[PDB]
Amino acid sequence: LADDISKGYNAALNYLSYQLRTRKEVEDKLRSLDIHEDYISEIINKLIDLDLINDKNYAESYVRTMMNTSDKGPKVIKLNLSKKGIDDNIAEDALILYTDKLQVEKGVTLAEKLANRYSHDSYRNKQNKIKQSLLTKGFSYDIIDTIIQELDLI
């Protein structure tokens, strides 16, 4: 009855007190407890109102985290966000924080390590491997070209 919505609110705050969660993560965590859509929606809106669920904030902190702790570029950061239930629109707004100059600087750092790793290759084969590595990590062609121009300066 009314103890349904109650159990729902309780599990939600347990799940959130620890880590940050996307709306969808909570939206289908209430289902892990067999709570109807009639009630999940009531719980979710209330949580959003109390700012306990906030996808813009989720996406922004994720982006800051990856910028600071990973070697991943915008494209991979975005698909990670999509895999968590973040709207494309919200992910895109959040990715605005990963400025070109910041991407290039992280890319130059990775490129420098790889240059040393492939130090025996020809300049051409060397850059191909580096561009390839940066592409699989999520950086765009233009960003990679700027990284390559930067690396040669070095």
Q: What is the CATH number of domain 99-154?
A: 1.10.10.10
CATH number 1.10.10.10 given to 1-53: yes
CA distance 34 to 153: 60
CATH number 1.10.10.10 given to 54-98: yes
Give the residue extent of every domain in the chain: 1-53, 54-98, 99-154
DSSP secondary structure letter of residue 85: T
Q: By CB neighbour count within 10 A (0-12 exposed, 13-18 middle, 19+ buried), where does 104 fall?
A: buried
- Say what the resolution is, in angstroms: 2.0
Give the angle subtended at the CA of 131 by the CAs of 115 and 107, to the nearest 5°.
70
Closest CA to 81 of 141, 12, 24, 14: 24
**C-beta neighbour count of 123 within 10 angstroms:** 9
Cβ pair 112, 85 in contact under 8 A = no
Q: Do the domains 54-98 and 1-53 match in fold?
A: yes
Question: Which whole-number Å values give the CA distances from 1 to 6, 7, 27, 58, in the listed order?
Answer: 9, 11, 20, 32
